[PDB]
Amino acid sequence: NIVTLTRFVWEEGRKARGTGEMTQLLNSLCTAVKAISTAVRKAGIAHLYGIAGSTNVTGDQVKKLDVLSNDLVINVLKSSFATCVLVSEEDKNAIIVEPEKRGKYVVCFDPLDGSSNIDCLVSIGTIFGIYRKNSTDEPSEKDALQPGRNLVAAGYALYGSATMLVLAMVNGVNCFMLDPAIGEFILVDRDVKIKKKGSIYSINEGYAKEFDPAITEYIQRKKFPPDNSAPYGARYVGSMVADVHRTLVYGGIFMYPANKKSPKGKLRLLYECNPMAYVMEKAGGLATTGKEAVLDIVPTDIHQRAPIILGSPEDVTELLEIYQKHA
Amino acid sequence: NIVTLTRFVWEEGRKARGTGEMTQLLNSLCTAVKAISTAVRKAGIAHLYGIAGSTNVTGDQVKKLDVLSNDLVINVLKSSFATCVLVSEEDKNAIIVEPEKRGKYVVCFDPLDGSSNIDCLVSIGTIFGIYRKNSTDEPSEKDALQPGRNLVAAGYALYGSATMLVLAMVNGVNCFMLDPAIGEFILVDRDVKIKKKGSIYSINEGYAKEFDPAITEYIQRKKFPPDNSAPYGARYVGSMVADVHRTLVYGGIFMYPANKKSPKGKLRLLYECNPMAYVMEKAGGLATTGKEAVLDIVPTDIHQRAPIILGSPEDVTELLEIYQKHA
Amino acid sequence: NIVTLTRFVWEEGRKARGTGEMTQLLNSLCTAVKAISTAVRKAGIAHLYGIAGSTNVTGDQVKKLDVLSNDLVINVLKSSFATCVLVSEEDKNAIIVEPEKRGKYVVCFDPLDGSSNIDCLVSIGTIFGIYRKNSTDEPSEKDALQPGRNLVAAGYALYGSATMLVLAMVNGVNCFMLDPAIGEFILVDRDVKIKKKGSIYSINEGYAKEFDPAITEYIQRKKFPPDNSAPYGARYVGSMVADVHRTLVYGGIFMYPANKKSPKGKLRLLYECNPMAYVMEKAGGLATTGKEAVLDIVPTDIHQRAPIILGSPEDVTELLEIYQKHA
Amino acid sequence: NIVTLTRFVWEEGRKARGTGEMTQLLNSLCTAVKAISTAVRKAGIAHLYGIAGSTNVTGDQVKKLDVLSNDLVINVLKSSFATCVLVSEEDKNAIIVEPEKRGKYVVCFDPLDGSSNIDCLVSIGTIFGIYRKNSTDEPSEKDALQPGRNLVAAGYALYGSATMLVLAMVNGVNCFMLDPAIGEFILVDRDVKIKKKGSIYSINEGYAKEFDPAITEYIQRKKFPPDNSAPYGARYVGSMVADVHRTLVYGGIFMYPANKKSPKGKLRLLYECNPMAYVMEKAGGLATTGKEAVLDIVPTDIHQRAPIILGSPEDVTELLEIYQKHA
Ligand SMILES: Nc1ncnc2c1ncn2[C@@H]1O[C@H](COP(=O)(O)O)[C@@H](O)[C@H]1O
Ligand SMILES: Nc1ncnc2c1ncn2[C@@H]1O[C@H](COP(=O)(O)O)[C@@H](O)[C@H]1O
Ligand SMILES: Nc1ncnc2c1ncn2[C@@H]1O[C@H](COP(=O)(O)O)[C@@H](O)[C@H]1O
Ligand SMILES: Nc1ncnc2c1ncn2[C@@H]1O[C@H](COP(=O)(O)O)[C@@H](O)[C@H]1O
Ligand SMILES: O=P(O)(O)OC[C@H]1O[C@](O)(CO)[C@@H](O)[C@@H]1O
Ligand SMILES: O=P(O)(O)OC[C@H]1O[C@](O)(CO)[C@@H](O)[C@@H]1O
Ligand SMILES: O=P(O)(O)OC[C@H]1O[C@](O)(CO)[C@@H](O)[C@@H]1O
Ligand SMILES: O=P(O)(O)OC[C@H]1O[C@](O)(CO)[C@@H](O)[C@@H]1O
Ligand SMILES: [Mg+2]
Ligand SMILES: [Mg+2]
Ligand SMILES: [Mg+2]
Numbered sequence A, B, C, D: 001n002i003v004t005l006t007r008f009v010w011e012e013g014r015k016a017r018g019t020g021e022m023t024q025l026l027n028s029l030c031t032a033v034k035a036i037s038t039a040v041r042k043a044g045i046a047h048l049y050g051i052a053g054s055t056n057v058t059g060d061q062v063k064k065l066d067v068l069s070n071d072l073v074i075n076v077l078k079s080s081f082a083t084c085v086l087v088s089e090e091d092k093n094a095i096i097v098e099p100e101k102r103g104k105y106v107v108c109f110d111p112l113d114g115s116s117n118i119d120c121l122v123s124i125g126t127i128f129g130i131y132r133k134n135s136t137d138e139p140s141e142k143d144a145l146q147p148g149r150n151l152v153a154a155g156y157a158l159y160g161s162a163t164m165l166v167l168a169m170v171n172g173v174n175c176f177m178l179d180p181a182i183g184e185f186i187l188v189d190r191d192v193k194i195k196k197k198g199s200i201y202s203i204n205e206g207y208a209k210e211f212d213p214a215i216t217e218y219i220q221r222k223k224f225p226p227d228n229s230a231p232y233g234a235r236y237v238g239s240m241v242a243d244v245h246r247t248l249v250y251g252g253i254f255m256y257p258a259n260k261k262s263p264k265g266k267l268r269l270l271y272e273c274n275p276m277a278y279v280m281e282k283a284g285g286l287a288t289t290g291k292e293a294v295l296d297i298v299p300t301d302i303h304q305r306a307p308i309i310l311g312s313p314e315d316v317t318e319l320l321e322i323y324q325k326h327a
């Protein structure tokens, strides 16, 4: 028996006795992701470039891709009827859903992540996190400011060589590969577990001059092992979604620590760090700032940043013990 | 006035006064590339997972994406009628073409490069180079041992967020985007030129402990600019096709130098290094082992390796100077 | 707000307070239909024809299309968990679903209809009818033998110039167009109503010599109107699904009356006539044998045939009154 | 050994000693055909219905499939560099090509035929014919008034259950299936020949009351064979492209004779009748007005109509005899 994304969420929803609202919300993400995937893959681009003449639009319009993604995501989510608040990376303010379309779920998302790789055609993706609304108050920003630990579902779509959607929930992590011939995601990996230990480390070493001594020491150790084993390989694609997926699936460690340009980290906590930390923990892995668990942080700004270290438990831990040794 | 790959090749053929044999060869390759693209993006994956039933099969028994790619290329090329010898990464020996199907061209390719990335869905590609056959004697392996300087055409397809075909000939480098809705590459970037100086460096820093002193000095300068300029950023996807493409388009440098466990470099001369050296030079860049232009090596074995450093002219030149300083 | 098939069935299901089982069953048809559509449209056919060599399958296998369709349909339905009995046109016996996968719904279907048009590439389609199981007995054939009037949902997919899925239920008829770029059906026509009267008649006149006098008289009247208006146009595609859809959407009348080769009609009652009659009545139209309503017939053979006349009410009626005038 | 349309055209070009101008012309058409196909099958229809938002628009304001088709064809042909005059169904006057873009070929086409079928999703097609330019004077409309006998190439694309391109030249008719997964037509039927005698007749029987006596006699014989043979079956899709294709492949006859409200027939000479007459004759069939081979008419107006009867040689001959018997 083959399992499709659609069927899988449905089955899970019954097991959990849902009213179906969260299930429709998930079905809606899928749609969004398929629509983004098709755009990213450049289908229909011959029109932009004149295959039918440059007479095609009467006035002004073409779209950047992340603008489009954002529109797809927002619009599909509202149409779901499952949400009351949304937080996009592209909006200075939480969007609040009209009462007619208002469900009970808060959704944080990065509609298109890894934009310095968009032009060079490198892997890019979409990041999401779902919360249940925890107040009887009219829906506002505060509803989005919960710790990642209160997540009900999270995950990401990866537009790589193929398109994959990874979904994490209370019971674990599942991967579905998009079949673009029939528009259906297919469970291809079930209940995924990251290796305890890894052989790849992933960090942008260009900030070498600004790392703290923990990260400096750890990096040396990945390259000149004290036990004299083979040094870790290094991979940094530059798209968080890509680097984290490879981390999930081959194991190892991903790092985006604090900097002078950012002393608080670069990556966003609501819609980059959190969901990626939820996925890592559901899969037997760790996600820390160096000092504490990403999921336990209570945000104050929807666009707050945080340092993030995630990956195999022995690897992350090894770095936590350096921070400890140092403090 | 939209220019598709087929038209462009056709015209370039006219200007060259071609017999039309090479043009057909290139048309053939486009077709191989669109076919691999669809396979890589997993159209019809649902059949492999029993959508239609017939579910005994999913086991370690069926054709890998890398093997499929190879077959597509060999067959689509032979069917061209323009080739007499092919070299593939995936075969110990050059394939001699059937006298009946024979043509003058010699083709070296890597049907699918970046196979450490395959399972994690990161970008992967196809690299190729085309030579004119030098001797009059029967077609034999040694027809492929010609230095890169002799390349009549060379380039690659990147399967990334989108699929792209980059093609370099005597008079420049051009980029064509695959519109998978119609099966057609659209020229999106004409006569491409790499910038003189980038701000990104690409290398696997995990081999730090095997690096020669110049590579070592070089990295340091990128991190701690002795002149106080901004430090370069780092990127290493792990797929040559992707790292190189980014280098073409954003500028900067890409390096797979010799190291102790790879005393000759790891990347293959005939179908990885030469193809990308040719693109880089046709685009105003450099490609060097550290002591010598890659294109000038006289090859001695079809699977020979070479150290390769390629990218923007100023960034390669700076490194070469370091190499000179280490006499 | 755009409505997708998925969302539409969901919304309807809640309104009707379903446990969701019938809703998953519908979601499962969709999938099946997308999969059939992609096959029919010939995607991936380059493999059959050797694009990768004729070395591709080790032993014996390619599939006819209606065989495939059948496998898709059966397998997707079982996987739904919504069914206990299925009746395919391709199976001499009702399939009975294993108790582990056994839902409460009986499904009758023609997996691929219009097969004399398959080779000439004319429009083809899939026909379905859903019943609720009406016994507390272990599920057997008798569960499929209900009159069309006990239908809970029915409809068809059309693989024409575009692919459309038409769905009828207690409350009416809705059309969704397949967007093959993102694999999603889009409500494009809502609550469809056939015209009271039409200007097209549709019958295979080649059986002229064997019609009864009712049909003979009616045909003359469509061609030499007694009121002297313009004669109806004639259309017979040869695929029931195509002729009936055009009937639904432009109005008029479709006929496949009794014959000597068939004195009982050609078309099958469980999975051709019934669903097509349910769709016609939900849309303000009529479906008769000449003597009685198709939906009211209680079948005795799952593969029983019946005469069928359907289309605009004034048109069908005009023919009923000829039968009456004659009897 | 798989043969794609591009290869086939290329070779036929070699054998013909072509300049390669006509070959490019045909390549261009393939590209137009794949583009219309995608549009007809409704990829990206979700955008027209506000998936991405921007929902003011769906109203009677945006480009019809028929207009889009026309633009694709004109532009893709002009970009060929092989044409000096085009005739389209959709334009009152021939389009003269810009001297800069000029070539020797004259092209008559029907970008989208069967528009009464468009809304019901029944098959529709694109018909074309190519002439060599006869005079030396400036390119003008009258360059298109050449009898069909002069056609250098002719054929059509059928958008049906699958998309097909049928192409007839001096040395035969071949059929190529579009694999929309890779954007490539595959030759599936080589040197096609219509059978001598079919058992299907195609006509709009609704015009019975305007039919000339021979057509009338003819129909009767198909229904009541005076020799007691089996009666022919009837089929009339309503789209010339589909009815004709079926005629090519199953055999039999297709008829649009003159009738009183269409005293000259309805179908257009330059871009409907000639293109299909040429295919039929190159395939061993006949095409006649009833008194004269269609290809021999000297046309006098680019939108002139003609009565046309085409199909198997025995079935056309039988009808012609009836016409002779009516002196
Ligand atoms: N598809 C699903 N998968 C897993 N849990 C679900 C699903 N649907 C609902 N639930 C659980 O039930 C809770 C209430 O669902 P709902 O009743 O739709 O708001 C959710 O917050 C989930 O924890
Ligand atoms: N499409 C083309 N683009 C650029 N150069 C070409 C093309 N076709 C042929 N040539 C040049 O002309 C030489 C002979 O062409 P051919 O007769 O096809 O072998 C080739 O080796 C190329 O150097
Ligand atoms: N998606 C739906 N649309 C319309 N009616 C439905 C739907 N789902 C369930 N129902 C109605 O509720 C009945 C019981 O549904 P179920 O509880 O799924 O067996 C069905 O037989 C339908 O009449
Ligand atoms: N691809 C082709 N297939 C068949 N005949 C061709 C082809 N190309 C050219 N010809 C024949 O040669 C003539 C001159 O070709 P051209 O130089 O392309 O105008 C054409 O009018 C055709 O009759
Ligand atoms: O170039 P930098 O500073 O390493 O940042 C790249 C990071 O930025 C992001 O685009 C988020 O801004 C991530 O996808 C990625 O990890
Ligand atoms: O893991 P390493 O040693 O850095 O290798 C990366 C290189 O591996 C290769 O796959 C070797 O073919 C290249 O595509 C890529 O540049
Ligand atoms: O050629 P005939 O006898 O008119 O039958 C065609 C009919 O047969 C069917 O294929 C069902 O067998 C219908 O789709 C269609 O209406
Ligand atoms: O409805 P009628 O008069 O039979 O016309 C059918 C004919 O109409 C046309 O659309 C006229 O272009 C043809 O495609 C088709 O053969
Ligand atoms: Mg973003
Ligand atoms: Mg981001
Ligand atoms: Mg390689």
Ligand SMILES: [Mg+2]
Pocket: B089, B090, B110, B111, B112, B113, B114, B115
């Ligand atoms: Mg390889």
Ligand SMILES: [Mg+2]
Pocket: C066, C089, C110, C111, C112, C113, C114
């Ligand atoms: Mg059938």
Ligand SMILES: [Mg+2]
Pocket: C089, C110, C112, C113, C114, C272
């Ligand atoms: Mg049938």
Ligand SMILES: [Mg+2]
Pocket: D089, D110, D112, D113, D114, D272
């Ligand atoms: Mg027409």
Ligand SMILES: [Mg+2]
Pocket: D089, D090, D110, D111, D112, D113, D114, D115
């Ligand atoms: Mg037209």
